[PDB]
Design a protein around this motif. Structure first.
Motif, short mmCIF file in Angstrom:
data_model
loop_
_atom_site.label_atom_id
_atom_site.label_comp_id
_atom_site.label_asym_id
_atom_site.label_seq_id
_atom_site.Cartn_x
_atom_site.Cartn_y
_atom_site.Cartn_z
N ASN A 60 0.82 -1.21 0.00
CA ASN A 60 0.00 0.00 0.00
C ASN A 60 0.86 1.26 0.00
O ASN A 60 0.46 2.28 -0.56
CB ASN A 60 -0.95 0.02 1.20
N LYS A 61 2.03 1.20 0.64
CA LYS A 61 2.90 2.37 0.68
C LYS A 61 3.43 2.72 -0.71
O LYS A 61 3.65 3.90 -1.01
CB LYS A 61 4.04 2.15 1.66
N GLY A 62 3.64 1.72 -1.56
CA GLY A 62 4.06 1.94 -2.92
C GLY A 62 2.94 2.08 -3.93
O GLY A 62 3.21 2.25 -5.12
N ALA A 63 1.69 2.02 -3.48
CA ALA A 63 0.54 2.10 -4.38
C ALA A 63 0.02 3.51 -4.57
O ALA A 63 -0.99 3.70 -5.26
CB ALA A 63 -0.59 1.20 -3.86
N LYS A 64 0.67 4.51 -3.98
CA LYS A 64 0.24 5.89 -4.13
C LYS A 64 0.83 6.50 -5.40
O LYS A 64 2.04 6.38 -5.65
CB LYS A 64 0.66 6.71 -2.91
N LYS A 65 -0.02 7.12 -6.20
CA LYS A 65 0.35 7.85 -7.43
C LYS A 65 0.90 6.83 -8.44
O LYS A 65 0.36 5.72 -8.54
CB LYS A 65 1.30 8.99 -7.09
N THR A 66 1.93 7.19 -9.21
CA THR A 66 2.56 6.35 -10.22
C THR A 66 1.63 6.05 -11.39
O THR A 66 1.48 6.88 -12.29
CB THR A 66 3.07 5.03 -9.61
N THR A 67 1.01 4.87 -11.39
CA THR A 67 0.26 4.41 -12.56
C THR A 67 -0.95 5.29 -12.83
O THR A 67 -1.84 5.41 -11.98
CB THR A 67 -0.18 2.96 -12.35
N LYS A 68 -0.98 5.89 -14.01
CA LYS A 68 -2.07 6.77 -14.44
C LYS A 68 -1.90 7.03 -15.94
O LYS A 68 -1.08 6.38 -16.61
CB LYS A 68 -2.08 8.07 -13.64
N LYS A 69 -2.68 7.98 -16.47
CA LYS A 69 -2.50 8.53 -17.82
C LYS A 69 -2.62 7.43 -18.88
O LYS A 69 -1.66 7.08 -19.57
CB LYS A 69 -1.17 9.27 -17.93
N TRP A 70 -3.83 6.90 -18.99
CA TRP A 70 -4.14 5.89 -20.00
C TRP A 70 -4.59 6.49 -21.33
O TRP A 70 -4.94 5.74 -22.24
CB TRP A 70 -5.21 4.93 -19.48
N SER A 71 -4.60 7.82 -21.45
CA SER A 71 -4.99 8.49 -22.68
C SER A 71 -3.84 9.35 -23.19
O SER A 71 -3.02 9.85 -22.40
CB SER A 71 -6.24 9.36 -22.47
N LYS A 72 -3.78 9.52 -24.51
CA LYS A 72 -2.70 10.31 -25.11
C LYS A 72 -2.91 11.80 -24.89
O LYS A 72 -1.96 12.52 -24.56
CB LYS A 72 -2.59 9.99 -26.60
N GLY A 73 -4.14 12.28 -25.05
CA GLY A 73 -4.44 13.69 -24.84
C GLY A 73 -4.35 14.55 -26.08
O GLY A 73 -5.37 15.02 -26.58
N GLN A 74 -3.13 14.76 -26.59
CA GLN A 74 -2.88 15.55 -27.80
C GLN A 74 -3.40 16.98 -27.63
O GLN A 74 -4.37 17.41 -28.27
CB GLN A 74 -3.48 14.88 -29.04
N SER A 75 -2.73 17.71 -26.73
CA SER A 75 -3.07 19.09 -26.40
C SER A 75 -3.14 19.99 -27.63
O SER A 75 -2.56 19.67 -28.68
CB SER A 75 -2.06 19.66 -25.41
N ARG A 76 -3.83 21.12 -27.51
CA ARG A 76 -4.10 22.02 -28.62
C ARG A 76 -3.58 23.42 -28.31
O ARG A 76 -3.30 23.76 -27.16
CB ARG A 76 -5.60 22.07 -28.92
N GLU A 77 -3.45 24.22 -29.37
CA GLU A 77 -3.04 25.61 -29.23
C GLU A 77 -4.23 26.47 -28.83
O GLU A 77 -5.36 26.26 -29.28
CB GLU A 77 -2.44 26.12 -30.54
N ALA A 78 -3.97 27.46 -27.97
CA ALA A 78 -5.02 28.34 -27.49
C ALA A 78 -5.56 29.22 -28.61
O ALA A 78 -4.86 29.54 -29.57
CB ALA A 78 -4.50 29.21 -26.35
N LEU A 79 -6.83 29.60 -28.48
CA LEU A 79 -7.50 30.48 -29.43
C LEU A 79 -7.50 31.89 -28.86
O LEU A 79 -8.14 32.16 -27.84
CB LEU A 79 -8.93 30.00 -29.70
#
Ligand SMILES: [K+]
Ligand SMILES: [K+]
Ligand SMILES: [K+]
Ligand SMILES: [K+]
Ligand SMILES: [K+]
Ligand SMILES: [K+]
Ligand SMILES: [K+]
Ligand SMILES: [K+]
Ligand SMILES: [K+]
Ligand SMILES: [K+]
Ligand SMILES: [K+]
Ligand SMILES: [K+]
Ligand SMILES: [K+]
Ligand SMILES: [K+]
Ligand SMILES: [Mg+2]
Ligand SMILES: [Mg+2]
Ligand SMILES: [Mg+2]
Ligand SMILES: [Mg+2]
Ligand SMILES: [Mg+2]
Ligand SMILES: [Mg+2]
Ligand SMILES: [Mg+2]
Ligand SMILES: [Mg+2]
Ligand SMILES: [Mg+2]
Ligand SMILES: [Mg+2]
Ligand SMILES: [Mg+2]
Ligand SMILES: [Mg+2]
Ligand SMILES: [Mg+2]
Ligand SMILES: [Mg+2]
Ligand SMILES: [Mg+2]
Ligand SMILES: [Mg+2]
Ligand SMILES: [Mg+2]
Ligand SMILES: [Mg+2]
Ligand SMILES: [Mg+2]
Ligand SMILES: [Mg+2]
Ligand SMILES: [Mg+2]
Ligand SMILES: [Mg+2]
Ligand SMILES: [Mg+2]
Ligand SMILES: [Mg+2]
Ligand SMILES: [Mg+2]
Ligand SMILES: [Mg+2]
Ligand code: NA
Ligand code: NA
Ligand code: NA
Ligand code: NA
Ligand code: NA
Ligand code: NA
Ligand code: NA
Ligand code: NA
Ligand code: NA
Ligand code: NA
Lengths: 105, 80
Positions: free
Chosen positions: A16-35
């Motif tokens: 449990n002590k090592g189960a905090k944070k780490t594994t996440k971000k299962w999507s690529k995202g592909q950020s965009r430029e602001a308008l």
RNA sequence: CGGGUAAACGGCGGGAGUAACUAUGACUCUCUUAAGGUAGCCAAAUGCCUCGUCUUCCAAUUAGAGACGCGCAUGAAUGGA
RNA sequence: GGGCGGCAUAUCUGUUACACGACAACGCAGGUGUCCUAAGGCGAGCUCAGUGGGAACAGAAAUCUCACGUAGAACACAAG
RNA sequence: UUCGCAAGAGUGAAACUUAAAGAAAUUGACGGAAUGGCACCACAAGACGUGGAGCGUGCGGUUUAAUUUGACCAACACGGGGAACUUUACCAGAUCCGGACAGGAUGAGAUUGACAGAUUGAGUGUUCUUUCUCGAUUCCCUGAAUGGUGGUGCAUGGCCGCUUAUGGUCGGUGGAGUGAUUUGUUUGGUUGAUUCCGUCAACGGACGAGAUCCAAGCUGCCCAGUAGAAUUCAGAAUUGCCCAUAGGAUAGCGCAUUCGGUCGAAUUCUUCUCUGCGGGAUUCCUUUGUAAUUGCACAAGGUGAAAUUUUGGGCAACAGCAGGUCUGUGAUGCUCCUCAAUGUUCUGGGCGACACGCGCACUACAAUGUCAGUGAGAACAAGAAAAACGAUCGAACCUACUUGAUCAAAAGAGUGGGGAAACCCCGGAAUCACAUAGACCCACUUGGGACCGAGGAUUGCAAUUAUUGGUCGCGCAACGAGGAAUGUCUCGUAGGCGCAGCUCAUCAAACUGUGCCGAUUACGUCCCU
RNA sequence: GCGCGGAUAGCUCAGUCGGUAGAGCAGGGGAUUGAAAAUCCCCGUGUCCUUGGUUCGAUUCCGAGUCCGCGCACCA
RNA sequence: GCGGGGUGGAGCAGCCUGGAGCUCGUCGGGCUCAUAACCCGAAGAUCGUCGGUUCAAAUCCGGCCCCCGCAACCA
RNA sequence: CACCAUGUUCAA
């Protein structure tokens, strides 16, 4: 219950002590430029709306915003004004959507 | 956790409370009355204990006597 | 440059973990070669340590024989048994 | 002894070395075969290494500021 | 020991070990063997998700005095299990006997209960000091007995879940085997169907399937002063010339429309509504269709409200499971505790405790949107109390209207109605709509509300560990569509959207129903299970 | 014969050379089971080798050692 | 005396200043009735230790502690 | 015709 074999309390605690944070971000995202869309009309932008926006075959608040780099809220406001002066004509209208087009001759 | 309904065998710190036994007073009614002698030979008796005033509380029943208060068994009213 | 050829000259690995007493390691992991020593044989005229360890031979055995094999550095026509 | 090792085979600084100069050992502690068109030449401005007081994010340590600072820095590379 | 170049060949024990090893058939079960079918708790074509985020909840772990416990496809919003006290079974403590009855020792003083002070968490006679009251009900001790959400569901009853949603199961007599066993119950076509037709060492039966039952749609009789409608009189309203701040499209061309408060009358009726029995649908009708070479049927279309189990459910055989429940019962055997109790009450805490992992939900990530207005509009349903208490009703229960209001919400009050087709109620639900000439304009942003601060009100005997609303703040908490995986589903369905009941003094992210808006895809297959 | 390295719980093995005792296995008691194996939770352990300097004190720093390992001891 | 090596729990690259890689192992979640295999992710380094150089050290220069080799000849 | 190993001891 599926009590794991040879699983310790120290093994439990280290899990449990090592189960905090780490594994996440299962999507690529592909950020965009602001308008960068202006919220008020400038002199040169307002001049374009009064001259260039007419004689457009299809006129729409989202189209005009894509041309003059302005917000749709004030893009629609200018289009309602151009109709008050009969420079453009309104073909389709509702509460949420307005379609305009150039006048003949 | 613990075994289902297993005897605990817990230590006791406070001393055990004894059961209250009614302390018996011998010849009670002899103490509630004082016998007087009249000159004709007849005996007159008057109770040395107060009567609880309330008619609901024992019409013809007595009332206790302590150094600091005076109460009754039935009506439970106390006088100080 | 490209093939063949070792009865041509020759050559023929290392580290770590692992079986319900404990040893041990059938088992597994990893680095690696052209191939990583096979069948056999051995302290052998080949073993440094070494007068190796066990058995036998003697009253007493750095000797002899039979075993064992982590073999400094045994081994197959450099022929092995 | 020779061999193996090393190099004391050409050569620089400190010490041995005995306050001129000179001085041995396979004596001690280290270097040399390179590097630089600027790391050469000159002129002018400046002062270094460090401390101490202070200034958002900023903390031992980033940058600014004021003092003290005889070199305790730097001068390509060993040392003087 | 003989023979062989060798490899081996011939001959051939014992010690010891062991209760079976074998053979052929039968019935099951299994097969990465074959055949024929079927099912979106399977796939195919797809939909909408779950797995990624926050939060509700259950489960495991950790923690703890205790964090009660069962269950591990067919456990994990399950135990109707949304626990403030109670419930409650757990923990720290304090009462009561609810130890009947029988036999003994006391005993008309056996006992019961207590104000005051202190013991205590307790203005708790629990106990104690001090006495009064009670009265033969009780205490003392021996056996016994009772109670228990104590154990054991692997001792059981009952009920439930599952095997197992498919088409399965069993005698009698006869035939065949020495027998288990087999036939019947079989193959061919058909059907969801061991459903039928045909064949037949089987003939007669029984159960399951089907039928039956309950709700939907169409309709008949009946029916209304607990449902409604249309006319006729009166009473009131609009009334024609009017072209929006830009004002398009969309019916009208003998008597013009409205007015559930105009709480107006009269008359007529059953078009909507209520419903106890009925009717109606069955392969009924037609193919120069499939099949037929008898049949049983099938496919398209027709008729029709409905066209194939009409649709959706309920019931559901025989064999079982060491499935769940001894935490439903005054269901229970055995066993455990039994007067400082594992009984029973009372106080307090816990069931909620958080480095974490998992199931199931809720809310999202925005423009097919969020806000602020306005319009039109459902259905299933629930509503109050006693041998108590006040003067046979009347109060609890649900509401409507008014007020509060000479100024926020949530409240708080008053009046009236409703025992429920009568009041709520013309049931103004939310999705939805709006030519609203409304704000926002692509950004973790007016998206998203997690988390936290202060005020106030309500429920309750008690709100701290916020019970629940309402107000203003925080929003710089993640979250911009979610890896490997994985659930459910074929038409008024999925998905979306609310509403009621249920738990309920207070509290639905739950379940049980209900209606509203409403699709994509397929009309298959045996590749996976 | 001499030199070097080890003697810590019931056994095995860690321990900043100067405050450290970490463990596994063997045991006792519970969870799970229909009873068991296995698995998990909770409890009993210990200076070694002997003198000194004792850092404020020693497995840990020195002397002696035992008791065990590991090397090495004419010349021709 | 000469030469080479200490790198995540194991084995081994990088050792060519500015950095740690590969396989296995460990952990979390999937698949499975369950374990393994398989799939999707994660964590774990004083590069033996003590100094020096450099703006900067696994990586360069010295000492130390281990590990492994090659030599140890003629008397 | 890719790969598909296993299931502690007695007793229902
Ligand atoms: K040679
Ligand atoms: K002899
Ligand atoms: K210069
Ligand atoms: K057979
Ligand atoms: K099922
Ligand atoms: K829990
Ligand atoms: K109870
Ligand atoms: K049962
Ligand atoms: K069946
Ligand atoms: K017969
Ligand atoms: K069929
Ligand atoms: K059933
Ligand atoms: K049955
Ligand atoms: K195995
Ligand atoms: Mg060999
Ligand atoms: Mg040998
Ligand atoms: Mg010899
Ligand atoms: Mg001899
Ligand atoms: Mg010999
Ligand atoms: Mg020999
Ligand atoms: Mg050789
Ligand atoms: Mg040879
Ligand atoms: Mg010499
Ligand atoms: Mg001189
Ligand atoms: Mg001189
Ligand atoms: Mg499935
Ligand atoms: Mg989630
Ligand atoms: Mg998660
Ligand atoms: Mg099933
Ligand atoms: Mg459930
Ligand atoms: Mg609650
Ligand atoms: Mg109880
Ligand atoms: Mg009971
Ligand atoms: Mg059972
Ligand atoms: Mg049969
Ligand atoms: Mg059956
Ligand atoms: Mg309680
Ligand atoms: Mg709970
Ligand atoms: Mg509040
Ligand atoms: Mg519930
Ligand atoms: Na210069
Ligand atoms: Na023979
Ligand atoms: Na068989
Ligand atoms: Na699909
Ligand atoms: Na998801
Ligand atoms: Na027969
Ligand atoms: Na028969
Ligand atoms: Na019982
Ligand atoms: Na199949
Ligand atoms: Na047995």
């Amino acid at each position: 219950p599926p009590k794991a074999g040879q699983t310790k309390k120290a093994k439990m605690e280290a899990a449990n002590k090592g189960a905090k944070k780490t594994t996440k971000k299962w999507s690529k995202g592909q950020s965009r430029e602001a308008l960068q869309n202006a919220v008020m009309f400038d002199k040169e932008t307002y001049d374009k709306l009064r001259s260039e926006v007419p004689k457009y075959k299809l006129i729409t608040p989202s189209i005009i915003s894509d041309r003059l780099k302005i917000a749709v809220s004030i893009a629609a406001a200018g289009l309602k004004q151009l109709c008050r002066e009969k420079l453009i004509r309104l073909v389709s209208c509702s509460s949420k959507t307005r379609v305009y087009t150039r006048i003949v001759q | 956790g613990g075994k289902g309904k297993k005897k605990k065998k817990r230590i006791f710190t406070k001393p055990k409370k004894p059961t209250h036994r009614h302390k018996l007073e011998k010849m009670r009614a002899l103490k509630y009355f004082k016998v007087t002698e009249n000159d004709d030979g007849s005996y007159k008796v008057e109770r040395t204990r107060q009567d609880c005033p309330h008619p609901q509380c024992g019409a013809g029943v007595y009332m206790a006597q302590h150094k600091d208060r005076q109460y009754c068994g039935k009506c439970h009213l106390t006088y100080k």
